[PDB]
Design a binder for this molecule. Structure first.
Ligand SMILES: OC[C@H]1O[C@@](CO)(O[C@H]2O[C@H](CO)[C@@H](O)[C@H](O)[C@H]2O)[C@@H](O)[C@@H]1O
Ligand SMILES: CS(=O)(=O)Nc1ccc(C(=O)O)cc1
Ligand SMILES: CS(=O)(=O)Nc1ccc(C(=O)O)cc1
Ligand SMILES: CS(=O)(=O)Nc1ccc(C(=O)O)cc1
Length: 358
Protein backbone atom coordinates (compact mmCIF):
# COMPACT_ATOMS: atom_id res chain seq x y z
CA UNK A 1 0.00 0.00 0.00
CA UNK A 2 1.03 3.63 -0.34
CA UNK A 3 3.12 4.38 2.69
CA UNK A 4 1.16 7.52 3.57
CA UNK A 5 -2.06 5.43 3.83
CA UNK A 6 -0.31 2.70 5.82
CA UNK A 7 1.10 5.22 8.26
CA UNK A 8 -1.97 7.38 8.88
CA UNK A 9 -4.20 4.34 9.31
CA UNK A 10 -1.91 2.47 11.71
CA UNK A 11 -1.05 5.59 13.67
CA UNK A 12 -4.69 6.57 14.10
CA UNK A 13 -6.32 3.17 14.65
CA UNK A 14 -3.78 1.48 16.90
CA UNK A 15 -4.33 3.94 19.76
CA UNK A 16 -8.08 3.97 19.15
CA UNK A 17 -8.15 0.24 19.67
CA UNK A 18 -6.10 0.52 22.84
CA UNK A 19 -8.15 3.38 24.28
CA UNK A 20 -11.50 1.80 23.48
CA UNK A 21 -10.45 -1.81 24.29
CA UNK A 22 -11.71 -3.00 20.89
CA UNK A 23 -11.05 -6.76 20.43
CA UNK A 24 -10.91 -6.71 16.64
CA UNK A 25 -11.12 -4.21 13.83
CA UNK A 26 -11.01 -3.95 10.08
CA UNK A 27 -10.47 -0.77 8.11
CA UNK A 28 -10.64 -0.01 4.40
CA UNK A 29 -9.42 3.18 2.85
CA UNK A 30 -10.57 3.95 -0.68
CA UNK A 31 -7.89 6.25 -2.23
CA UNK A 32 -8.21 7.39 -5.81
CA UNK A 33 -10.94 4.80 -6.11
CA UNK A 34 -8.82 1.76 -5.04
CA UNK A 35 -9.18 -0.08 -1.71
CA UNK A 36 -6.54 -0.72 0.92
CA UNK A 37 -7.24 -3.00 3.86
CA UNK A 38 -6.02 -3.24 7.44
CA UNK A 39 -6.91 -5.60 10.25
CA UNK A 40 -6.19 -5.99 13.94
CA UNK A 41 -7.00 -8.32 16.74
CA UNK A 42 -9.62 -10.95 17.14
CA UNK A 43 -12.94 -11.86 15.61
CA UNK A 44 -13.36 -14.52 18.34
CA UNK A 45 -11.25 -14.06 21.41
CA UNK A 46 -11.88 -17.51 22.91
CA UNK A 47 -11.18 -19.38 19.65
CA UNK A 48 -8.22 -17.12 18.77
CA UNK A 49 -9.62 -16.31 15.41
CA UNK A 50 -8.04 -13.19 13.90
CA UNK A 51 -9.87 -10.48 12.03
CA UNK A 52 -9.31 -10.95 8.31
CA UNK A 53 -10.60 -9.31 5.16
CA UNK A 54 -13.28 -12.05 5.15
CA UNK A 55 -14.51 -11.49 8.71
CA UNK A 56 -18.21 -10.56 8.91
CA UNK A 57 -19.19 -7.70 11.18
CA UNK A 58 -22.68 -6.50 12.17
CA UNK A 59 -23.20 -3.17 10.48
CA UNK A 60 -26.05 -2.10 12.74
CA UNK A 61 -27.49 1.14 11.51
CA UNK A 62 -25.06 1.36 8.58
CA UNK A 63 -27.66 -1.12 7.17
CA UNK A 64 -29.90 1.90 6.62
CA UNK A 65 -27.71 2.92 3.70
CA UNK A 66 -28.62 -0.33 1.94
CA UNK A 67 -32.28 0.25 2.78
CA UNK A 68 -32.12 3.77 1.37
CA UNK A 69 -30.50 2.61 -1.86
CA UNK A 70 -33.00 -0.26 -2.25
CA UNK A 71 -35.77 2.27 -1.79
CA UNK A 72 -34.08 4.52 -4.34
CA UNK A 73 -33.96 1.61 -6.79
CA UNK A 74 -37.73 1.03 -6.26
CA UNK A 75 -38.40 4.68 -7.05
CA UNK A 76 -36.25 4.42 -10.17
CA UNK A 77 -38.19 1.30 -11.22
CA UNK A 78 -41.42 3.27 -10.90
CA UNK A 79 -42.70 0.98 -8.18
CA UNK A 80 -43.07 3.62 -5.45
CA UNK A 81 -42.97 7.38 -5.16
CA UNK A 82 -41.57 9.11 -2.05
CA UNK A 83 -44.43 11.57 -2.25
CA UNK A 84 -46.98 8.63 -1.89
CA UNK A 85 -48.93 8.41 1.38
CA UNK A 86 -47.89 5.56 3.63
CA UNK A 87 -51.47 4.33 3.41
CA UNK A 88 -51.14 3.66 -0.31
CA UNK A 89 -48.87 0.76 0.60
CA UNK A 90 -50.53 -0.18 3.86
CA UNK A 91 -54.25 0.60 3.62
CA UNK A 92 -54.88 -1.18 6.90
CA UNK A 93 -53.22 1.79 8.55
CA UNK A 94 -56.50 3.55 9.05
CA UNK A 95 -55.81 5.63 12.13
CA UNK A 96 -56.12 9.33 11.44
CA UNK A 97 -52.64 10.42 12.52
CA UNK A 98 -51.35 8.75 9.36
CA UNK A 99 -53.00 11.35 7.16
CA UNK A 100 -50.26 13.30 5.49
CA UNK A 101 -47.36 10.93 6.39
CA UNK A 102 -45.53 10.03 3.20
CA UNK A 103 -42.85 7.49 2.36
CA UNK A 104 -40.39 10.41 2.36
CA UNK A 105 -41.25 11.13 5.99
CA UNK A 106 -40.66 7.51 6.96
CA UNK A 107 -37.37 7.30 5.09
CA UNK A 108 -35.98 10.50 6.64
CA UNK A 109 -37.21 10.30 10.25
CA UNK A 110 -39.58 13.20 9.77
CA UNK A 111 -42.99 11.53 10.29
CA UNK A 112 -43.51 13.28 13.64
CA UNK A 113 -41.62 11.34 16.28
CA UNK A 114 -41.81 7.66 15.50
CA UNK A 115 -40.01 5.75 18.30
CA UNK A 116 -36.38 4.72 18.18
CA UNK A 117 -37.21 1.01 18.43
CA UNK A 118 -40.00 -1.27 17.50
CA UNK A 119 -40.82 -2.86 20.91
CA UNK A 120 -39.48 -6.37 21.47
CA UNK A 121 -43.02 -7.54 22.17
CA UNK A 122 -43.97 -6.97 18.53
CA UNK A 123 -43.72 -10.55 17.15
CA UNK A 124 -46.30 -10.80 14.33
CA UNK A 125 -47.66 -8.87 11.47
CA UNK A 126 -50.81 -8.15 13.49
CA UNK A 127 -48.66 -6.83 16.34
CA UNK A 128 -46.80 -4.53 13.92
CA UNK A 129 -50.02 -3.05 12.55
CA UNK A 130 -51.28 -2.44 16.09
CA UNK A 131 -48.01 -0.73 17.02
CA UNK A 132 -48.20 1.78 14.15
CA UNK A 133 -51.97 2.30 14.54
CA UNK A 134 -51.47 3.09 18.25
CA UNK A 135 -48.47 5.41 17.86
CA UNK A 136 -49.29 9.03 18.74
CA UNK A 137 -47.15 11.62 16.94
CA UNK A 138 -45.53 14.30 18.77
CA UNK A 139 -45.42 16.73 15.91
CA UNK A 140 -46.90 17.31 12.49
CA UNK A 141 -45.12 15.49 9.66
CA UNK A 142 -42.23 17.27 8.03
CA UNK A 143 -41.36 19.47 11.00
CA UNK A 144 -38.74 17.65 13.10
CA UNK A 145 -36.18 14.92 12.61
CA UNK A 146 -36.01 12.25 15.31
CA UNK A 147 -33.83 9.26 14.43
CA UNK A 148 -35.88 6.06 14.45
CA UNK A 149 -35.55 2.43 13.41
CA UNK A 150 -39.35 2.23 13.32
CA UNK A 151 -39.39 5.00 10.65
CA UNK A 152 -36.84 3.86 8.07
CA UNK A 153 -37.60 0.24 8.91
CA UNK A 154 -41.23 0.73 7.86
CA UNK A 155 -40.07 2.59 4.75
CA UNK A 156 -37.98 -0.45 3.75
CA UNK A 157 -40.85 -2.89 4.33
CA UNK A 158 -43.30 -0.77 2.28
CA UNK A 159 -40.87 0.04 -0.46
CA UNK A 160 -40.56 -3.58 -1.53
CA UNK A 161 -44.28 -4.36 -1.49
CA UNK A 162 -44.94 -3.69 -5.20
CA UNK A 163 -42.00 -5.91 -6.18
CA UNK A 164 -43.64 -9.06 -4.94
CA UNK A 165 -40.39 -10.00 -3.13
CA UNK A 166 -39.48 -10.26 0.55
CA UNK A 167 -37.21 -7.42 1.74
CA UNK A 168 -34.30 -9.86 1.89
CA UNK A 169 -34.92 -11.24 -1.58
CA UNK A 170 -35.23 -7.73 -3.02
CA UNK A 171 -32.03 -6.61 -1.35
CA UNK A 172 -30.15 -9.69 -2.63
CA UNK A 173 -31.39 -9.53 -6.17
CA UNK A 174 -31.45 -5.77 -6.65
CA UNK A 175 -28.46 -4.49 -4.61
CA UNK A 176 -26.09 -7.16 -3.36
CA UNK A 177 -25.89 -9.32 -6.50
CA UNK A 178 -25.47 -6.53 -9.10
CA UNK A 179 -22.74 -4.95 -6.97
CA UNK A 180 -21.00 -8.31 -6.37
CA UNK A 181 -21.43 -8.10 -2.62
CA UNK A 182 -21.20 -11.86 -2.28
CA UNK A 183 -20.23 -11.86 1.41
CA UNK A 184 -22.99 -9.51 2.63
CA UNK A 185 -25.96 -11.01 4.42
CA UNK A 186 -29.21 -10.22 6.15
CA UNK A 187 -29.11 -13.71 7.63
CA UNK A 188 -25.65 -15.22 8.07
CA UNK A 189 -25.71 -18.72 6.47
CA UNK A 190 -24.27 -21.67 8.39
CA UNK A 191 -21.50 -21.96 5.82
CA UNK A 192 -20.32 -18.44 6.79
CA UNK A 193 -20.39 -18.84 10.53
CA UNK A 194 -16.68 -19.52 10.64
CA UNK A 195 -16.18 -15.96 9.41
CA UNK A 196 -18.78 -14.27 11.63
CA UNK A 197 -17.11 -12.25 14.36
CA UNK A 198 -18.51 -12.23 17.81
CA UNK A 199 -19.48 -8.87 19.21
CA UNK A 200 -18.31 -8.03 22.71
CA UNK A 201 -20.39 -6.23 25.31
CA UNK A 202 -19.23 -6.14 28.94
CA UNK A 203 -16.74 -8.82 27.91
CA UNK A 204 -19.49 -11.22 26.80
CA UNK A 205 -19.69 -12.53 23.22
CA UNK A 206 -22.94 -11.45 21.63
CA UNK A 207 -24.76 -11.34 18.29
CA UNK A 208 -27.68 -9.13 17.39
CA UNK A 209 -31.08 -10.41 18.46
CA UNK A 210 -34.02 -10.98 16.04
CA UNK A 211 -36.62 -8.25 16.00
CA UNK A 212 -39.39 -6.79 13.91
CA UNK A 213 -38.05 -4.76 10.99
CA UNK A 214 -34.50 -5.81 11.83
CA UNK A 215 -33.44 -6.51 8.29
CA UNK A 216 -34.65 -3.09 7.18
CA UNK A 217 -33.06 -1.03 9.96
CA UNK A 218 -30.04 -2.77 11.41
CA UNK A 219 -29.63 -6.32 10.17
CA UNK A 220 -26.85 -6.44 7.53
CA UNK A 221 -23.55 -8.24 8.17
CA UNK A 222 -20.63 -7.75 5.78
CA UNK A 223 -16.89 -7.99 5.27
CA UNK A 224 -14.43 -5.15 4.96
CA UNK A 225 -14.00 -6.04 1.24
CA UNK A 226 -17.67 -5.89 0.48
CA UNK A 227 -17.99 -2.65 2.44
CA UNK A 228 -15.16 -1.12 0.43
CA UNK A 229 -16.98 -2.15 -2.72
CA UNK A 230 -20.19 -0.56 -1.28
CA UNK A 231 -18.23 2.66 -0.78
CA UNK A 232 -16.83 2.49 -4.30
CA UNK A 233 -20.33 2.06 -5.68
CA UNK A 234 -21.64 5.04 -3.73
CA UNK A 235 -18.59 7.15 -4.67
CA UNK A 236 -19.01 6.52 -8.38
CA UNK A 237 -22.60 5.46 -9.22
CA UNK A 238 -22.17 6.24 -12.93
CA UNK A 239 -19.97 3.12 -13.18
CA UNK A 240 -22.96 0.95 -12.20
CA UNK A 241 -24.43 -0.72 -15.25
CA UNK A 242 -27.90 -1.33 -13.85
CA UNK A 243 -29.64 1.93 -14.48
CA UNK A 244 -32.26 1.75 -11.73
CA UNK A 245 -29.55 0.90 -9.17
CA UNK A 246 -27.36 3.77 -10.41
CA UNK A 247 -30.34 6.09 -10.10
CA UNK A 248 -31.22 4.67 -6.71
CA UNK A 249 -27.76 5.38 -5.35
CA UNK A 250 -28.09 8.90 -6.57
CA UNK A 251 -31.52 9.34 -4.93
CA UNK A 252 -30.17 8.14 -1.59
CA UNK A 253 -27.57 10.92 -1.64
CA UNK A 254 -30.05 13.61 -2.56
CA UNK A 255 -30.59 16.25 0.12
CA UNK A 256 -34.16 16.20 1.41
CA UNK A 257 -33.95 18.10 4.71
CA UNK A 258 -31.45 20.31 6.47
CA UNK A 259 -30.81 20.62 10.17
CA UNK A 260 -27.85 22.69 11.16
CA UNK A 261 -25.00 21.69 8.83
CA UNK A 262 -26.40 18.27 8.01
CA UNK A 263 -28.55 17.07 5.21
CA UNK A 264 -30.67 13.96 5.40
CA UNK A 265 -30.59 11.53 2.53
CA UNK A 266 -32.14 8.05 2.30
CA UNK A 267 -30.01 6.29 4.88
CA UNK A 268 -26.95 8.41 4.06
CA UNK A 269 -26.38 11.75 5.72
CA UNK A 270 -24.31 14.53 4.21
CA UNK A 271 -22.40 17.67 5.03
CA UNK A 272 -20.93 20.06 2.50
CA UNK A 273 -17.22 19.51 1.88
CA UNK A 274 -15.01 21.04 3.12
CA UNK A 275 -16.29 20.05 6.50
CA UNK A 276 -15.63 21.41 9.95
CA UNK A 277 -15.99 18.23 11.95
CA UNK A 278 -16.94 19.91 15.22
CA UNK A 279 -20.67 19.30 14.71
CA UNK A 280 -20.14 15.59 14.08
CA UNK A 281 -17.65 15.03 16.95
CA UNK A 282 -18.56 17.49 19.76
CA UNK A 283 -21.74 19.24 18.67
CA UNK A 284 -25.31 18.82 17.71
CA UNK A 285 -24.80 15.98 15.23
CA UNK A 286 -22.39 13.84 17.28
CA UNK A 287 -25.03 11.16 17.91
CA UNK A 288 -24.46 10.91 21.66
CA UNK A 289 -28.02 11.98 22.40
CA UNK A 290 -31.29 11.14 20.73
CA UNK A 291 -32.06 14.64 19.50
CA UNK A 292 -35.32 16.11 18.20
CA UNK A 293 -34.31 18.77 15.73
CA UNK A 294 -36.39 21.04 13.55
CA UNK A 295 -35.85 20.54 9.85
CA UNK A 296 -36.00 22.72 6.82
CA UNK A 297 -37.40 21.05 3.72
CA UNK A 298 -35.17 21.25 0.64
CA UNK A 299 -37.79 21.81 -2.00
CA UNK A 300 -37.00 20.22 -4.38
CA UNK A 301 -34.26 17.94 -3.05
CA UNK A 302 -30.77 18.76 -4.24
CA UNK A 303 -29.33 16.04 -6.45
CA UNK A 304 -26.36 14.25 -4.94
CA UNK A 305 -23.63 16.84 -4.39
CA UNK A 306 -20.13 15.67 -5.30
CA UNK A 307 -18.47 18.00 -2.78
CA UNK A 308 -19.98 16.26 0.23
CA UNK A 309 -18.86 14.32 3.29
CA UNK A 310 -21.32 11.43 3.02
CA UNK A 311 -21.50 9.21 6.10
CA UNK A 312 -23.36 6.87 8.38
CA UNK A 313 -22.60 5.50 11.82
CA UNK A 314 -24.02 2.32 13.24
CA UNK A 315 -23.88 0.00 16.16
CA UNK A 316 -25.36 -3.13 17.61
CA UNK A 317 -24.95 -4.29 21.19
CA UNK A 318 -21.57 -5.83 20.30
CA UNK A 319 -20.37 -3.83 17.25
CA UNK A 320 -19.55 -0.34 16.10
CA UNK A 321 -19.27 0.69 12.47
CA UNK A 322 -18.67 3.84 10.47
CA UNK A 323 -18.53 4.73 6.80
CA UNK A 324 -17.62 8.07 5.22
CA UNK A 325 -16.72 9.15 1.74
CA UNK A 326 -16.13 12.27 -0.35
CA UNK A 327 -17.21 11.74 -4.00
CA UNK A 328 -15.23 14.69 -5.36
CA UNK A 329 -12.03 13.24 -3.96
CA UNK A 330 -12.63 9.58 -4.78
CA UNK A 331 -11.85 8.99 -1.10
CA UNK A 332 -13.54 6.98 1.61
CA UNK A 333 -13.23 4.87 4.71
CA UNK A 334 -14.91 1.97 6.38
CA UNK A 335 -14.26 1.11 10.04
CA UNK A 336 -15.71 -2.11 11.43
CA UNK A 337 -15.19 -3.14 15.08
CA UNK A 338 -16.58 -5.86 17.32
CA UNK A 339 -17.22 -3.57 20.23
CA UNK A 340 -19.68 -0.69 20.34
CA UNK A 341 -17.59 2.34 21.23
CA UNK A 342 -18.56 6.03 21.23
CA UNK A 343 -19.50 7.62 17.93
CA UNK A 344 -17.34 10.72 18.44
CA UNK A 345 -14.24 8.56 18.64
CA UNK A 346 -15.15 6.88 15.36
CA UNK A 347 -15.73 10.13 13.57
CA UNK A 348 -12.56 11.71 14.99
CA UNK A 349 -10.47 8.80 13.70
CA UNK A 350 -12.12 8.83 10.30
CA UNK A 351 -11.63 12.55 10.00
CA UNK A 352 -7.99 12.26 10.97
CA UNK A 353 -7.39 9.67 8.25
CA UNK A 354 -9.37 11.25 5.44
CA UNK A 355 -8.23 14.82 6.19
CA UNK A 356 -4.62 13.59 5.92
CA UNK A 357 -5.22 11.92 2.59
CA UNK A 358 -7.55 14.44 0.85
O1 LIG B 1 -30.92 -2.98 18.59
C1 LIG B 1 -31.25 -2.58 17.27
C2 LIG B 1 -30.62 -1.27 16.92
O2 LIG B 1 -31.09 -0.17 17.73
C3 LIG B 1 -30.02 0.67 18.10
C4 LIG B 1 -30.41 2.12 17.99
O3 LIG B 1 -30.70 2.46 16.67
O4 LIG B 1 -29.65 0.39 19.46
C5 LIG B 1 -30.64 0.28 20.43
O5 LIG B 1 -30.75 -1.08 20.82
C6 LIG B 1 -29.63 -1.68 21.51
C7 LIG B 1 -29.89 -3.16 21.82
O6 LIG B 1 -30.94 -3.26 22.74
C8 LIG B 1 -29.34 -0.85 22.80
O7 LIG B 1 -28.24 -1.42 23.47
C9 LIG B 1 -29.07 0.58 22.42
O8 LIG B 1 -28.95 1.41 23.57
C10 LIG B 1 -30.24 1.12 21.65
O9 LIG B 1 -30.06 2.47 21.30
C11 LIG B 1 -28.87 0.24 17.19
O10 LIG B 1 -27.60 0.54 17.80
C12 LIG B 1 -29.13 -1.26 17.03
O11 LIG B 1 -28.55 -1.82 15.85
C1 LIG C 1 -37.94 17.62 0.43
S1 LIG C 1 -39.43 17.80 -0.80
O1 LIG C 1 -39.03 18.31 -2.09
O2 LIG C 1 -40.19 16.57 -0.84
N1 LIG C 1 -40.37 18.97 -0.15
C2 LIG C 1 -41.18 18.83 0.95
C3 LIG C 1 -41.39 17.62 1.63
C4 LIG C 1 -42.21 17.56 2.76
C5 LIG C 1 -42.76 18.72 3.23
C6 LIG C 1 -43.64 18.68 4.45
O3 LIG C 1 -44.10 19.73 4.90
O4 LIG C 1 -43.93 17.59 4.95
C7 LIG C 1 -42.52 19.92 2.60
C8 LIG C 1 -41.79 20.00 1.47
C1 LIG D 1 -27.91 7.81 20.94
S1 LIG D 1 -28.85 6.54 20.24
O1 LIG D 1 -28.45 5.27 20.81
O2 LIG D 1 -30.21 6.92 20.41
N1 LIG D 1 -28.46 6.49 18.69
C2 LIG D 1 -28.64 7.50 17.76
C3 LIG D 1 -29.52 8.56 18.01
C4 LIG D 1 -29.65 9.57 17.07
C5 LIG D 1 -28.95 9.50 15.84
C6 LIG D 1 -29.18 10.60 14.87
O3 LIG D 1 -28.79 10.40 13.67
O4 LIG D 1 -29.75 11.66 15.21
C7 LIG D 1 -28.16 8.43 15.61
C8 LIG D 1 -27.96 7.45 16.57
C1 LIG E 1 -41.99 20.05 -5.67
S1 LIG E 1 -40.85 20.16 -4.18
O1 LIG E 1 -40.28 18.87 -3.92
O2 LIG E 1 -39.89 21.20 -4.34
N1 LIG E 1 -41.77 20.52 -2.90
C2 LIG E 1 -42.28 21.76 -2.63
C3 LIG E 1 -42.00 22.91 -3.37
C4 LIG E 1 -42.59 24.13 -3.02
C5 LIG E 1 -43.47 24.19 -1.97
C6 LIG E 1 -44.07 25.49 -1.59
O3 LIG E 1 -44.99 25.53 -0.72
O4 LIG E 1 -43.59 26.45 -2.18
C7 LIG E 1 -43.74 23.06 -1.24
C8 LIG E 1 -43.16 21.85 -1.55
Amino acid sequence: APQQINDIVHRTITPLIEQQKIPGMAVAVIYQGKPYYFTWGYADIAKKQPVTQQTLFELGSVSKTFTGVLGGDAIARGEIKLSDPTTKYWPELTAKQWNGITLLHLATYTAGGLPLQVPDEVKSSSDLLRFYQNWQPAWAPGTQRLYANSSIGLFGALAVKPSGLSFEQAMQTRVFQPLKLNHTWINVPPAEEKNYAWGYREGKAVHVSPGALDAEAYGVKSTIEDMARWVQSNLKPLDINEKTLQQGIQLAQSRYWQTGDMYQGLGWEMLDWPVNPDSIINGSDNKIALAARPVKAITPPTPAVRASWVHKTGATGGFGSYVAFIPEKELGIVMLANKNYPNPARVDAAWQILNALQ
